[PDB]
Each structure stands twice: as C-alpha cells, then as structure tokens.
Design an enzyme around this catalytic site. Structure first.
Site, PDB file in Angstrom:
ATOM      1  CD  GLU A   1      11.722  -6.896   5.191  1.00 32.31           C
ATOM      2  OE1 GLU A   1      12.032  -8.096   5.939  1.00 32.31           O
ATOM      3  OE2 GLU A   1      11.165  -6.280   5.797  1.00 32.31           O
TER       4      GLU A   1
ATOM      5  CB  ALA B   1       2.221  -0.277   6.454  1.00 27.26           C
TER       6      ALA B   1
ATOM      7  NE  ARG C   1      10.168   5.812   7.761  1.00 21.55           N
ATOM      8  CZ  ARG C   1       8.982   5.326   6.396  1.00 21.55           C
ATOM      9  NH1 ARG C   1       9.143   4.859   6.264  1.00 21.55           N
ATOM     10  NH2 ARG C   1       7.919   6.467   6.826  1.00 21.55           N
TER      11      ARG C   1
ATOM     12  CG  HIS D   1      11.510  -2.395   3.693  1.00 22.91           C
ATOM     13  ND1 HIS D   1      10.682  -2.331   3.490  1.00 22.91           N
ATOM     14  CD2 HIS D   1      12.598  -3.140   4.406  1.00 22.91           C
ATOM     15  CE1 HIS D   1      10.023  -3.611   4.426  1.00 22.91           C
ATOM     16  NE2 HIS D   1      10.680  -3.922   4.803  1.00 22.91           N
TER      17      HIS D   1
ATOM     18  N   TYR E   1       9.486  16.851  -1.405  1.00 20.88           N
ATOM     19  CA  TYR E   1      10.270  15.188  -0.753  1.00 20.88           C
ATOM     20  C   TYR E   1      10.577  13.780  -2.331  1.00 20.88           C
TER      21      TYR E   1
ATOM     22  N   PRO F   1       0.725  -1.237  -0.437  1.00 16.52           N
ATOM     23  CG  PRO F   1       0.164  -0.982   2.139  1.00 16.52           C
ATOM     24  CD  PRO F   1       0.750  -1.872   1.655  1.00 16.52           C
ATOM     25  CG  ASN F   2      -0.215   3.799   1.498  1.00 19.76           C
ATOM     26  OD1 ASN F   2      -1.634   4.300   0.862  1.00 19.76           O
ATOM     27  ND2 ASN F   2      -0.231   3.187   2.530  1.00 19.76           N
TER      28      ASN F   2
ATOM     29  CG  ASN G   1       8.391  -2.165   0.031  1.00 21.01           C
ATOM     30  OD1 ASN G   1       7.675  -2.094   0.737  1.00 21.01           O
ATOM     31  ND2 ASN G   1       9.508  -0.960  -0.803  1.00 21.01           N
TER      32      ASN G   1
ATOM     33  N   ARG H   1       3.309  14.164  -3.992  1.00 19.94           N
ATOM     34  CA  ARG H   1       3.244  15.371  -3.044  1.00 19.94           C
ATOM     35  C   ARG H   1       3.681  15.822  -3.047  1.00 19.94           C
TER      36      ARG H   1
END
Lengths: 144, 144, 144, 144, 144, 144, 144, 144, 144, 144, 144, 144
Positions: free
Chosen positions: H100, H79, H109, H102, H24, H11-12, H76, H19
C-alpha cells in the site's frame, strides 16, 4: 463609561434553594444575584442578570449583549447546554466573549451532561464551585 | 386572488452581515427580504417574511400558514434544523408544502449539521447559494 | 379548595382532528378538554388545561404547578418528549408528581420517539389509548 | 464562446418512467434531457448530458469537465452519492463548481440516503422537485 | 359467559414483596391477583392471571388468548420486555390487543430497560403506578 | 422461446479454483457454468452466465435482464454485496426477480460480510452450499 | 432404516395462515409439514418435524439430532434467530450440519432481523421462497 | 529474466500538480512515473505503471499481475482504499504481495480515511513521503 | 442437615467431552459433577447440581435456592450469560450470593461473550480454569 | 500553620512557549510557576508545583498530597485527562479536593478531548483562560 | 556536525525473538539495532536507539530529540500507538519530524490496532516489512 | 528452588484500608501480602509481591517474571485493566500463565470497567471476593 457584563441563567435555575431547603441547600438564584451585584461594585463593572426557561430568550440576550457592546457574557444555559446548537451558533456569531458557568460539575453527573454546546463555542468554562463558579467567572470577565 | 408564501428564518440569521463585514461578508437579512419582495412582484405572489431565535415561533408560523391556506413555506430553521423533532412534526402535520433553505451547504460543515429534521419532513431542499438559495426556493414555490 | 391538576399539552397537539378528519381521526384537543372537565366534575378536582408550541412554556407551567401546590401534572410534551433535557430537569426539580401521556404508542413509531426525557423523570406513563390516555391519567392522578 | 455545463446522471436513472408508468409516473430521463436542452437555449449555454451505471464514468466526466474549462457540473450520482469517497475527492480536486441534484428528497427516505459524499464536496444541493430539481440547478449554474 | 382478559406476568414478579419486606415493600403478586379478580367482578369480565419465568410460556399464553377469542391481554413481560423479539412477533401475529404493564417506570431505571419489544408491538403501555398499573390496564381493557 | 435466466458473478469469482487448488478447493467458475448449462437443459431454460470485477457491469446486466424480459436473475455480487447501494437500487427498480447466491456462508465470516445490500432488495438468498448454491437457485428460478 | 432429517420450527410459525387468511395468506405450518413428508418419500429420508415457542426446546432438539446421528437439521428459529447465542453454540457444538430456513427474506425486513446467530454457525441459509425455502433445504440436505 | 512490478494508481491521482500549481504543488503523476522508471533501471526490474478512476480496473490489474507471475504490486487505491471490500478480496485472493502507498498520511486527515481495506489485506504500507512513498515501496518490492 | 449449595449449568454444557473427544478433550459434565460431590464431602456441604438448555429453568432454580435458604449458587449460564436480563434480575432479587463460573475465559473469546448479565449482578466470577473453575467456586462458596 | 496546595502538570506542558515563540506564544511553564508562587504569597499558602510526562508520577503526587494532608490539588493532566481511568481512581480514592485546569478550552478542540476522566472525579474545572486558569484555581483552592 | 536520528521502541519490543524462536522467528531487538547502526555508517548519520515499557519514557525521548535539534525520530510506540493521546501531543508539539514504524501490518491485525495516535501526528508511516520497516524509515529520514 | 509466583498490584491498591476505614473496609494491601506469604508457606511456593502506580512497572515485572522462569503471575492491574493494550501484549508475549485478580466485581461497577485488556490475554480471572480473590488465585497458581 462602565463596562457592562451580561449574566444569563437558563431553565430551572430560578428554583435554586426551594425543594426541602434543610436537605438540598438554602441558597437561591436571587441570593447569587445579590452576591454578584456587590462583587460588581468591588470590580467597577455593571452586571445585567437574567433567567428564562426559554432557549430563545438566552439567544435574544446573547444578541442583545453584542448590540450593546457588552464586555462579556457569563452563561449558565442549564439543560440547554447539552441540546442547543442554536446557543452554540449565537456564541460563535457574536464577538463578545462568553464564559460557561455551572454550579455543579456536569462531568461528575449523567453522561448526557458531558456534552456542552456552550463549551464548544465559549472562551472558557468554570464548573463545580456552586455560587463561587459565578464569582470566579465575574473576576476573570472583569480582567478581560 | 394572490397566493401568500411564508418565508421563515430561525435563530442567528438576523445577524447576517454584521460581525466584521470587510471580513465575513456585507449582505444582511433585510437585503435578502428586499430582493425577495421585488422577486415576489415579478412572480405575482405576496411573501410573509419573519425571523425568530425561538423554536416555538417557527412552529406557530408553520401552523399559522396552514390556517391562512398559504400556498407554500420557505423555511431556514438554522440550528433548529439539526435538533427540532417539533418542527419535523409541524411540517408533517400541515398540508402546506415546505421548502428547506440554507445559505451555506450544511453537508460541507460540521457532521452535526448533516442531520436535518426539516429535510426529513419537507418537500425539498435548496442549499449553498447564499441569497440565491431563497430566490430559487421562491421560483419553485410560485410554480407549485 | 378542590385539588387542582395541571394538564399540559406540547407542540402540534392543537392540530388534533383538523387535518383531513375523515383520515387522521375526527376528535380535537378541545373535545378532549371537554371530556376531561366533565370527568373532573365526577372526580371532585379542578383541571387546568394548556397547550403551547414552546418548550419554555411547558417548563414555566411545570414550575407554576409547584408554586400553586397542584396535586399532579399530566404532561404530553409531544415532540419535546424526545429532545428536552430541560423538561426532564423541571420534572425532577419540582415535588408535584408528573404523569407522562401520549395519544399514540411512541414505541410503535420511529426509533427517535423511543427516547422519553419525560418518562426518565416522571412517576409514570400512559400511552396509546388516544383520549382514554388522558382519562386514565386523570383517574390515577386523582387517587395520588 | 458559449459556457458549457455538464449534467451527469448516475446509476439506474436511465430507468426513470418505465416500471408500471400508469402507477410510478410517465416522465423518462430523455424527456428531462429534452426539457434541459430547451432551457439551455433560453439561457444561452450548451449542456452536455450523460448517464452511466459506473462510478468510474462519473469521475472521468468530472475530470473531463475541468480539462474543457466547463462553467459548472450538475451531478445526480444516484446511489453512489451515499458510497463514493472517490466522487467526493474528484469534486474537491477540480475547480469547476458542482451542484448536487436529486429528483426525490433523500432525507425523506432510508437513513442510508441521509449521507451525501457529493453534498460534502459540492457548492450546493437541490433536492425533491423531480425534473424541476434539474431546471433550478441549470438556472443557478447559468448565473454562476 | 363474559369477555375473558388474560393477565400474563413474566419472570421474577412471583418474588414481589418477599426479600426483606420491611425494606423493599410488603405487597405480593397474589395480593395484586386478588385486587384484580375483585375489579373484574365490578367490570363484568373473567380474568385469567398467570406467571412464568419462561419466555416460551408467555408466547404459548399470548397464542392461547387468540385461540379463545379473548378481548385483551395485559402483559408484564418483566426482563423479557427488553430482550424478546419472539414476544414482539407473538403480539404482532395475534389480533387480540395487548396492553404493556410495569409496576416501576422502566425509563427511570437502567438504560437497558428503555428498550421495549412489547411496547413496539402493543396497543399501549401503563408504567410506574405499582399495582395501580394493572388496575388502570384492566379498566382500559374492559372499555376496548 | 425458452425462458432465459441471467446468472451474474461479481469480482474475484473468476479466480475460483486457480489459487493453490489442493488447499482452496479444485472447482472453477467454468466448471460451475458447465454444471449449470447442463441443469438448464434438464429444466428447459436458457441460462446467460457472466462475470465482471466492475460494479457498473452488474447494474448494466440487471437492467439488460429487464429489457430482455428475462424470467429471473441469479446474482452473486461477491464483495459488492456488502458495499453496493447502486446494486440494491437496480434490483428494486427492475421487475425481474433476483435470487442472491453465495458459495460460502457470509454470516460465518468477517462482520463486514453480514451486510447484504443485495439481500435487502432480492426475493431470496441461497448461501453456503458451494456450486450447489447456484444449482438450488436455478431450480427455484425455473419454478418462479 | 433411512437417513433422518430434523426440521425444527421456532416461535409463532404455528400461527402461519390463521390471522385473517383472505388478507395474510391461506397456507399453514401443517400444509408445509404435509408437503415435506411427501418430498421425503421421493428423497428416501425420514423427516422429524417439530415446532415450539421455547428457545430451550430448539436446543434440546438440536442436541437430540446429534445423539441419533441425524444426517441434517433444517432450522427456522424464527425470532430466536436474532437473539439466541445459545442456539449458535448448540449448532457449533454438534457435528450434524444445520441449514437455516426463512419463509420471508429477513434482510428485506426490520434491521433487527439482519442479525442471524443461526446463520453465523450454520452450513448455509435459504430465505424468502415461503414453503419452497423448506423444499430447497430438504433437497440440499438429502444430497449432503 | 526480469522481475516485473505493477504500480497501480486509483482515482484522481492523474490530477496531481494541475489545480493552481504555484499554490497546491508543481510535481505530476508522470514526473513520479519518470522517477520510478529510472529507479527501476538502477534496480534491474521492469515496472508496469497504470491509473484508473475505475475500481474494477484496479481489480482486473491485480488479477492480471497474478496471471503474469509478477514479483509485486505497489497499490495507491486513493479513495477506493476506504470503500473497496472488492480490492481487499482481490489482494487476499492473489499470491503476489501488495504494498500500500499513499503520498499523504491518511491518518493525519479525515477520520473516514483512517479505514484501509487495502491495508487490511496488504503485506505492508508506506504513507506520507509524497513521491518518496513510491521510491521506498519500489526498493522494498525489489528486495522481496 | 448441612449448608446446601446449588450448582446450575446452562445450555450446551451437557455436551462437554462428546464431539470428537481425541480432538476437543475427554472430560464430561458428569466427571465434573463427580469431582464436586467428593469436594463437597471434604467441605461438609450438600451440593445440588443441575443442567438445562432452558433460560426459564435457571431462573426457577435460582428462585428455588432462595426458598430453601441455600448458602450459595454457583452459576455457569453458558450462552445465556450474554443475553439474559431475566437471570440478572433473578440474581438481584434473591438474597443468596451467586458465583459466576466459566470453564473458558470468555474475555479471550468473541466480543459478544465479553458481556455478562450474570457478572453484572453476581458477588464474583471465576473463569478459565476448566473444571478447576468449579472447584475454586465451591471452596469460596463454603467459606462465605 | 500554612496550607500546602499541590499544582500538578502532565505531559508536554513543560514545552509551553518554545516552538516558534513569535508565532505560537511567548509565555512558558516557569513564567506561570513564578506568577503562582507570588499569588501564593498574597494568599498565605505554600504551593508545590511539578510536571511529568509520566501518568504514574501524577498518581504518586495525588497520593503524596493525601499523605501530607494538603488542602487541595490543582491538576492539569494534559493528554492523560482523556485516557487515564487510573487518575480518575486516584482522585476518587483521596479526600483532598482536586481542581481540573486547562490553559485552552478542550471542548473547543478535537472531540477526543471532550472526555475528561479528571473532570468525572474532580470537585470542579477551570478551562480556557491560559495562565489565568491556574490563578483562578489557586484563589478558589485557597478559599476551600 | 553529524545529524542525529532517534529510534524509539515502545513496550514488549525488547522481547522480539525469545518465545520459541524455532517457531515465531530468531531475530531480536539488538540484532535490528546492530543492522541499523551499520546502515547509519553507510548513510553518514548517528543513530540513538532506545526502548522502554513506559509511555512517559517515549515522551521524554521525543522532547529530548527536539532539545538536541535531532534531524528525525523513528518511533515504534508498540501498543501505546493505539492508546497514547500524550504521544500524539508530544509529536505535534515538537518540530522534529516523526516516522511511525511497525514490524507487522497493524491494519491486518485486531481492529483495536487500526487506531494510530502516532500516525495521526507523524509525517509518515512504514508498516509490515519486519526489520526492513526500520531500514526504510532510516533511508527516508536521512534524505529529509 | 521453590517455584516463585509474582503477585503484581497496579495503581491505587496501595491505598486499600487507609481512607476512612470504618466506611471503605479496614483491611490494607500489607495485610493481604501477610495473608499470602503465610498461604505460600502452607503451599510450598515463594511469592514476590509488588505494587506500582506506573503502567510501565507492571510490564517490566511481567517480563521479569518470564526471565526468572516464574511459575505464574497473579495480576491486579487496577484501572490499567481497562486501558492497557501494552499489558495485554506483555501477557500474550510471555509464556508464564497470568491470573487476573480483582477485589471487587468490576462487571458490577461503571460500564468502563466491563472492559478487561488483562482478561482478554490471561488464562483466567478471579473477581469479587476481596482478599479471598488473591488466596483462590494463589491455590489455582500453585496447582498449575
């Protein structure tokens, strides 16, 4: 004009040197106030020394120090050090630097005293030197 | 005839818009009281607006609102929201509905502010709209 | 002088019996004060009974009991029992024995009431007998 | 052009007012949609009202609101409020302000509902006013 | 034949006043049994006093008290107070009120003794008065 | 109508028997469906058997079972058993009894599988009997 | 001579249906023993049914079941389910399969009952069907 | 002949570089897909690149990769990495190795991102190189 | 008559070398008793060796050792090591030194076995040498 | 005649004022050593100033200070303050008083820095005054 | 001038491929150094490869890399990854980017290895590819 | 060759007997070395005895013992026992058996000493017998 430095004492510190003095020590909160008023003469600053068992009183006094453009606050919140989010917020809201003071070393005591809401918000901390903790705080506070 | 609504502000909210205003915002606690008194005219209710740095004052005021058959309390306990079992008990003991209010969104801040003893006892919560948090609370409180 | 025994009630206990008595149980904090004053005559002790919603007041009163060489303190800190490091330190700093009292059994309630800062510092604890909790405390306190 | 405001309902809210209505309340999710569509006429905004039992649907809809330059989202994520890092990230990624809404006061319920991934990312939260929680949210959202 | 009151002592209490008596105290568990049998004459109740190091025995005895329509149980579960979900269930299952008793104040000791499965299910608790803890328990139990 | 019983399988159960059968155990999710359809004939009930990797699908199906006045749901939420507050709320919101089923004993596995949001809301749980877990669930479900 | 199946009941289950029966239910532990002895005739197995308030007795009985080459043990450890590492070790040490049984669904109760030392070592668990929990256990146990 | 490698985005990630791009970052999810398709030509492998806001979609895709005898999955989960026991189970159930990936370093974080259900089940992890995280993953995945 | 040394074995140790001996080892608890009785002849001490599945029996035996002025107790509480506050109190109450013994190294096992109520109260601990753990314990105990 | 005072700096403090000085500050560890050597002249004490990235070096130095009958140690253990049980033990083993020093206020930083194994063993702590933390420490240390 | 890349190996990695090689793998730390020195030729960078069992050595080497304006550090802190605040601080203090490397996937191991002080401070992490973890790290580090 | 047994002492054990011997107990680390060298003659083994305040030294020595095919290591890691994952990994990586030794019983001390990374990896543990802890370890180590 003379810089004024608030010295604010929280609950139970008013009882210093009363319980069995020939066992737990002779020196009282007034004795420390007298030491500090003299040190304040040596340092060319006025010193406003207060104590209350009320959390709210310490906050009122922190806010009063900002209103009066005090140079510094030396704060021994005693037990409220470990509980008071409200004192943490007061210190962070005001521009006047705060020095945390303890007579004893709180990290050397019960685990619940390891937590310091004051320390999380303050410029710095002096712990464990008895009355000397205040005198060091007042020197550092004068040189700010 | 007129319903009375207590609006109770806890510690440090009295400092709203003072520290470097051209950085951390212009609006003050009085400005919000003035907004609210005007809204209260449009809504046909009297509004009793108070602030204290003392946990005990907010409890006295909660108890006073029950004694006076007040319609509602709008409560911003500030830092005491996260520590006060005593305020939780006061809200639960009284029959007068309590609306929790925050200017900021506490869930968006430090983890210690996620805990709300007020929220655990209150009817409801309005957070994060600044002054609008109070105005929404007062509309909801009038229609109760 | 008859030995004097302080009986100190914390926040919200002043509301006992008021809220919907035909549900929460008829008896009030005055009724308990009256029971206790009479028991105190049978026991040949004077009894100084006080209540405050303020944490600071309970500490002032603990310290005042030591200053007056009171024989004992019976303390129901209500919600502050679960939050007050400062009351814990007050009890430990004074030489007057403290008996913890609760009307209800706090261990039978919410997990946050399992913690007793008073109980960690007090001589002893009587819980769960309503007004009889105080009466038992006053007998034990007279025999100290 | 008319500002559009997404109102997004998570799982099980579609069941509102069905289980034993003459016990747990008569009002349904459609009834609230009807209330809100009328309030939206009064407020001069269009309102797009949706529900899904799927976490993914709420994220798609949050992203769809940014794509469509929506003015605001009113989000009742229901149980996903307490589990969804993904919804937290969606709110933070998009520029459209999000208002958290709950019918009930989640802090007054089970400890697992105290956690709000939505609240950690949202502008604000309105809880505990039943259908009035949505109506307050829509007023605040119109005045953004 | 009179109201009967069970008084049940758990593990290690049988060792009271034996280990180095001119150091850890002279009074024994029998001495307390003798005190209590005499108090029981003054109070017009029969008292059945028992001790075991076995958790199962305390449960059998709690169940036996219900079977025999006892007026009350005074229970000092000693270490099992902090471990026994089974004793918690026994107290909850039976109709006979249970009074928790401790010689010492467990909240003043190791953190593992703060937990009381007995206290979570009992009517009430008396702690910290040594043998007086039992005497108070028996008075309260007679007036039930 | 024969009473209808929903049997709902969550993520990854569709892979049963596929991966290295001569190691992980031969029997497949279809084989279990076939066993159950036959048992359902012996029991005089129809059985609606479904699987999804989607949390949302299990909730839709729980809600669909209430809409269709199904007699029972047998639910193996697989990994969602340990994460889904939303499935917990679905079970609690619907009036149809839910029986939790697991092939394996989750308490015998990783600590994160000890948590069962399904088990916290369901009537009952059958774990650890492989396919027999479902067969037992279907007998119990028929007798409801 | 047939397969023998031990059925072992822990503390307080002996009190089933006794306390206020016209409130907490009429059925007793004997009633369940009678049900099970009859089911055992239908199933062609002997059934040895026992109850004790002593953790040690349940261990002795688990060990006795292995010594006697029992086919299975059905174990309702009641409160000891949540405390007994010793019962966990007994189940693991013996070769005889153990089925965990609960009348109630423990996951639907207090969080301390979520923990199952029995369940961590047992083949399987049946919870929440009252007496039906035992009947299901005995069917599954016969087909092992 | 050609090995196929699934590359699955949660997601996202579809919002990458949208944005305020001049704040960013400029690069998008498509840009990374284009990079990867080109790298896949140099490496002699076909690459199946997908994104969903739905946890269930990533599971379907993991299962689809096993069914199609894919060489590898680059995952990936965004969340869902921190919440999905279901994705952990999907990776463990399938024989196809999972890498995995990222963009950011999750350990750098929020503490809630330190937990990786993907990482607990995957062959390996590449974090913190932005788009280069995928390119490294695809090289490693080709040489498997 | 010689120094007497109690050697007390808790639950399940009676099963040592029985379950599948050609897999989990051939040596039994009797074999170890025989080893120890012979070692006791070499060492000029009498040795009283006991086993029970009952926590209460181990306490009775610890208390019996003090009554009989035993030189030492060697205690393998097995699973009760990790649960028994009551055994912790028994060791602390008696003057006779206690040596903790384990066949296995409990720190090398499940995290729940890291906790030792015995070890918190005992003089010393010998773990991990199988039967040699007892032999070492008996040498150390003789030289006390 | 001259009292010697060890001043011991742990890992990374050697890097003070190097990384982008016109951003993260100009003053270096040598500058502070130079300040301190001068203060030591005014105070009539010799000062032994050392730094290591090695935990073992700080322990060797603490032990060396006892062997040399040093008057005091000023210790900034840097990161090892939060991890070193070994440094805690070294401070407790030696008779030479230790003053904890930090340039920054660790309570104002990451939660992992709230823990101080040094502070748990030291006489006292001075934090948050940069270089002035050392100067205050050296005054206090001279007057010991 | 040729960019230099430090490759720093923590404790026990020097033992790689020694314990029963025909069981736990043949490849050694030198073999990996040889692979990497050759890869460094292909990549046009010099590579300084070191190992120590000393936490302090890894910090000295991190600081040495900044002093020498190294392009990058590849760091496998081994067990110190999970304990070393001091290594976390070293990485954060220096401007040289750090890549975390592990042969194994630490998230697939014991929960104590899930914690990475290195990962909290590093640019990125490559885990789980054995020797390929280093080779990937060196490619990524060359392209920085 | 006589089998060689490494005996490795961690930080602060070098201070044994020095600090106020007429309080902390007379015997020194040399005295114990002398006892052990003599015991080693009676046992026909050579004994290599070392001490360091450096975690890294203990690891080097563990690795050196494997390189030299030593028969056993007796390891008293002192405070590093409670912090060192790296010592845990060293013990697990080497094939030489390790016996954990403590003079005191660490379970009888501060909760932070209950954790033993050595104990989690070692064959066995001897605690609480002062110097006799080593002597027992050396007998057990000779018989390995």
């Amino acid at each position: 004009k003379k810089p004024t430095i608030f010295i604010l004492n929280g609950p139970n510190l008013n009882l210093l040197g009363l319980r069995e003095p020939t066992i737990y020590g002779h020196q009282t909160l007034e004795d420390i106030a007298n030491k500090l008023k003299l040190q304040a003469e040596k340092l060319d600053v006025t010193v406003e020394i207060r104590q209350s068992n009320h959390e709210g009183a310490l906050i009122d006094w922190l806010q009063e120090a900002q209103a009066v453009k005090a140079k510094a606050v030396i704060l021994n919140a005693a037990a409220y050090t470990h509980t008071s989010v409200a004192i943490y917020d007061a210190i962070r809201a005001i521009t006047v630097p705060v020095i945390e003071v303890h007579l004893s070393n709180p990290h050397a005591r019960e685990a619940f005293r390891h937590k310091s809401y004051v320390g999380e918000a303050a410029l710095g901390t002096i712990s464990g030197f008895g009355a000397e903790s205040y005198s060091l705080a007042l020197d550092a506070a004068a040189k700010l």
